[PDB]
Amino acid sequence: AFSLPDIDYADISQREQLAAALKRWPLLAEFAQQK
Amino acid sequence: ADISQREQLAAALKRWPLLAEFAQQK
Amino acid sequence: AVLGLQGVRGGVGTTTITAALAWSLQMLGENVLVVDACPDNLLRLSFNVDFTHRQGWARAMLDGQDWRDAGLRYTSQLDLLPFGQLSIEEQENPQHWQTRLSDICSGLQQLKASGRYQWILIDLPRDASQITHQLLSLCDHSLAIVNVDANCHIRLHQQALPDGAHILINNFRIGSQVQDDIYQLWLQSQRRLLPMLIHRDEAMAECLAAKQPVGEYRSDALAAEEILTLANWCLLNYSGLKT
Amino acid sequence: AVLGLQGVRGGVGTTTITAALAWSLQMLGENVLVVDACPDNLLRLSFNVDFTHRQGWARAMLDGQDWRDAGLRYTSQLDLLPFGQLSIEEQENPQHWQTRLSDICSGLQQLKASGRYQWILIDLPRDASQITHQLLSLCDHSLAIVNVDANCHIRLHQQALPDGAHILINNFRIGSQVQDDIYQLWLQSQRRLLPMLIHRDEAMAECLAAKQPVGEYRSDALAAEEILTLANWCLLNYSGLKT
Amino acid sequence: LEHHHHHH
Ligand SMILES: Nc1ncnc2c1ncn2[C@@H]1O[C@H](COP(=O)(O)OP(=O)(O)OP(=O)(O)O)[C@@H](O)[C@H]1O
Ligand SMILES: Nc1ncnc2c1ncn2[C@@H]1O[C@H](COP(=O)(O)OP(=O)(O)OP(=O)(O)O)[C@@H](O)[C@H]1O
Ligand SMILES: [Mg+2]
Ligand SMILES: [Mg+2]
């Protein structure tokens, strides 16, 4: 059955508090990067 | 040293009924 | 309502939370049945059932006996249905019994129709077996249990959660930067995440060694208070039946 | 020698330890192959393999391809064999593929016979599948991974350990009376408990988010040095082949 | 162990 995404990274790279976290951890960055 | 270990274990089994149960049925 | 609890990974706290949540719901005046669907049969030990008590719903069913005779009373408002003890051969060859337990599903549906219980809680393994899938399908709601760590973060991107499940954090630590980074990212991206969580708490490590649910063992523990919050959330949001 | 690592339950640290031990052995100058036998396919992420890189030995075999094409080289002394990424459909129907992987056993035996590797480490799930049993049977030696808690204590009295396994503690904490009590009991009652253990360590939580084995990520972390003592114990005790 | 002090 169709559903909207349970995980939504839209505009994640514009939350300044998250910027340092994504730069700290390559694992987190690779899921959050745009496709 | 030997009896010291046995006395500390006695206290642990008294503290935790799960540990006493399993030790007593081994 | 029938509520399933299932870990996204082993060891995240699913069984301790199931026992604790059942205790909180019965304390709030609900009649509760708690069912262990995990073959390791651990839930019963949070309710002071003897380890050498071998009986349970699956044990009975596989022995050709009556699963309805395997229930235990814990309080006037909380009954328990252990899985039962499996032999090593049954443990090592689960394909031989995982398709022989379908009758528990029709039975639980009939028990739900009776109205004897306001809540039926099911502790579920994550093994993709036939019986696990069938039990999940009769749940009205489900909780997917996680810890905030890199393993669970990856898993949420590659495995299925139960349909409609919400995510419940357990084992939340004090003073971990990588944990805070994952958590802050989840708050902005994980649409299924519940607004409350459960902290790491020595009471949750001790209560099974004391053979009690956490709220009975230490009612003023932070984890006990957090479980009570979860119970009240379930009453408000998870009381509806699936259509 | 082939060394299997398998948690007594999920989430105890088996994969992080497998990656760390492989790194420590290759640091000591051993040639190592590390094989992921877990369908969750998580080991590769400790070696900077992209999440979207779906190739692996089991993925290849299920696709009718040569599993040897899925090997990856991390250093001149450490090769990696990911499991590969299963679809949700495959994950939810494990019996449609859990009996189609048996050719990996003779394949790994041929690779072992080449002499290219002094160590073949296998990250094993504990899902009682046909392929898991067959891969465990290939092992010359095995480590059963535990955490010191009431759940693992119960499991040690009701489930089988790999034959001849030694027991390795991970996630050992401070400030826990119940852990200290269980540990003192195990010291007296578990003959095959290893003399070294691994503490709960922030570097072991961070290294997977950095996509590195712990000893590469932070060589002066306590856990990295504890893993080094484990590696040296393996060199002295686990270098022989099973009769 | 190699050291009695480690990274914090
Ligand atoms: N919030 C917590 N704080 C501290 N310890 C906890 C917490 N939650 C669980 N634990 C401990 O972690 C261990 C595993 O808990 P539990 O048996 O509930 O997990 P599980 O997910 O059901 O595991 P399994 O995969 O064996 O079914 C137990 O010994 C428990 O005491
Ligand atoms: N000693 C430790 N200290 C702190 N964190 C740790 C430690 N060992 C493991 N972890 C963390 O615990 C999580 C689970 O570890 P890991 O993936 O190695 O477990 P596992 O037993 O292989 O789990 P699974 O059931 O998914 O196979 C990871 O996020 C890892 O970073
Ligand atoms: Mg459980
Ligand atoms: Mg693993």
Contacts of D206 (CB under 8 A, 6+ apart): A25, C177, C178, D217, D218
Q: How far is C153 from chain A (nearest CA, A)?
A: 8
Residue D182 in contact with partner chain A when CB distance is under 8 A: no
The alpha carbon of residue D126 and the mean position of all alpha carbons in its chain are separated, in whole angstroms, by 11
Q: How far is D10 from chain B (nearest CA, A)?
A: 22
List the strands of the sheet with C2-7, edge to edge. Answer: C72-75, C78-81, C32-36, C119-124, C2-7, C141-146, C166-169
Out of C42, C94, C176, the one facing D154 most closely (by C-beta) is C42
Are C152 and C146 spatial neighbours (Cβ–Cβ below 8 Å)?
Answer: yes
3-state secondary structure of C65: coil
Q: What is the DSSP letter of D193?
A: B
**Beta-ladder partners of D167:** D144, D193
Contacts of D38 (CB under 8 A, 6+ apart): D15, D83, D123, D124, D125
Q: Do C128 and D94 touch (CB under 8 A)?
A: yes
CA distances from D129 to C93, C233, D58, D125 (A): 8, 38, 14, 9
Residue C9 in contact with partner chain B when CB distance is under 8 A: no
- Residue C201's nearest CA partner among C169, C167, C171 is C171
Contacts of B2 (CB under 8 A, 6+ apart): none
Hey, what amino acid is at D77?
Q
Contacts of C84 (CB under 8 A, 6+ apart): C41, C54, C55, C56, C57, C58, C59, C60, C62, C70
Q: Do C51 and B17 touch (CB under 8 A)?
A: no
Whose atoms come closest to the Cα of D45: which ligand? 2
Enumerate the residues of chain C whose CB falls inside 8 A of the CB of residue B16.
Answer: 206, 209-210
Are B12 and D181 spatial neighbours (Cβ–Cβ below 8 Å)?
Answer: yes
Hey, what amino acid is at D165?
A
Q: What is the DSSP letter of C199?
A: B
Query: What does the buried/exposed string (b/e) look like for D64-78 if buried means 16 or more CB atoms within 10 Å of the residue's CB?
Result: eeebeebbbebeebb
DSSP for C127-186, written as a single string: S--HHHHHHHHT-SEEEEEE-SSHHHHHHHTTSPPPTTPEEEE-SBPSS-HHHHHHHHHH
Domain residue limits, chain B: 1-26
Pocket of ligand 2 (CB under 6 A): C 9-10, 149-151; D 7, 10-16, 38, 40, 42, 170-171, 198, 200-201, 204-205, 208, 223
Enumerate the residues of chain D whose CB falls inside 8 A of the CB of residue C56.
Answer: none
Q: How far apart are CA C75 and CA D164, in angstroms?
A: 44
Q: Do B18 and D178 touch (CB under 8 A)?
A: no
Question: The domain D2-238 belongs to what CATH superfamily?
Answer: P-loop containing nucleotide triphosphate hydrolases (3.40.50.300)
Element (H, E) at C3: strand C2-7
Ranges of beta strands (E only) in D96-227 are 119-124, 141-147, 166-170
Are C33 and C121 spatial neighbours (Cβ–Cβ below 8 Å)?
Answer: yes
- Per DSSP bridges, beta strands C72-75 and C78-81 are antiparallel
Q: Which of B14, B15, B19, B21 to mutate to test the interface with C (most CBs of C within 10 A)?
A: B21
How many angstroms separate the first and last alpha carbons of chain C?
A: 12
- Rounded distance from Cα C204 to ligand 1 centre (Å): 7
Where does residue A3 fall: left (phi above 0), alpha (psi -120 to 50 degrees), or beta otherwise?
beta
Site to substitute for ligand 1 among C14, C15, C16, most atoms within 8 A of C-beta? C16
Residue D159 in contact with partner chain B when CB distance is under 8 A: no
Hey, what amino acid is at D140?
D
Q: C-alpha dihedral over C21, C25, C28, C31, to 10 degrees? A: -160
Where does residue C100 fall: left (phi above 0), alpha (psi -120 to 50 degrees), or beta otherwise?
alpha
- Residue C43's nearest CA partner among C197, C234, C212, C224 is C212
3-state secondary structure of B11: helix
Q: How far apart are CA C203 and CA C220, in angstroms?
A: 10
Out of A24, A25, A31, the one facing D51 most closely (by C-beta) is A31
**Beta-ladder partners of C122:** C4, C35
Element (H, E) at C34: strand C32-36
Are D119 and D1 spatial neighbours (Cβ–Cβ below 8 Å)?
Answer: yes
Can chain E be said to touch chain C, i.e. do they have 3 or more Cβ pairs within 8 angstroms? no
**Beta-ladder partners of D72:** D80
**Beta-ladder partners of C33:** C79, C120
Q: How far apart are CA C206 and CA D239, in angstroms?
A: 39
Query: What does the buried/exposed string (b/e) look like for D93-121 if buried means 16 or more CB atoms within 10 Å of the residue's CB?
Result: ebeebbeebeebeebbeebbeeeebbbbb
Whose atoms come closest to the Cα of C154: which ligand? 2
Residue D28 in contact with partner chain E when CB distance is under 8 A: no
Neighbours of ion ligand 3 (CB under 5 A): C 14-15
Q: How far apart are CA E1 and CA D229, in angstroms?
A: 7
Query: What is the token pair recorded at A24?
Result: 């700290």
Contacts of C219 (CB under 8 A, 6+ apart): none
Q: How far apart are CA D111 and CA E8, in angstroms?
A: 41
Q: Is C36 in the pocket of ligand 1 (CB under 6 A)?
A: no
Enumerate the residues of chain D whose CB falls inside 8 A of the CB of residue B9.
Answer: 184-185, 188
Q: How far apart are CA D194 and CA D174, in angstroms?
A: 19
Q: What are the start-end ranges of the H helices in chain C? A: 14-27, 57-62, 88-92, 103-114, 130-137, 150-156, 177-189, 202-209, 214-217, 222-237
- Rounded distance from Cα D171 to ligand 2 centre (Å): 9
**Beta-ladder partners of C143:** C5, C166
Contacts of B5 (CB under 8 A, 6+ apart): D184, D188
Q: C-alpha dihedral over C25, C28, C30, C34, to 10 degrees? A: 20
Instruction: Look at the alpha carbons of C135, C138, C144, C145 in this order and tell me if their dihedral is positive or negative.
Output: negative
Enumerate the residues of chain D whose CB falls inside 8 A of the CB of residue C177.
Answer: 202, 206
3-state secondary structure of D228: helix
Q: How far is D103 from chain E (nearest CA, A)?
A: 41
Q: Residue C131, exposed/middle/buried by CB under 10 A (0-12, 13-18, 19+)?
A: buried
Q: Searching chain C, which residue's CA lies closest to the CA of residue B18?
A: C209
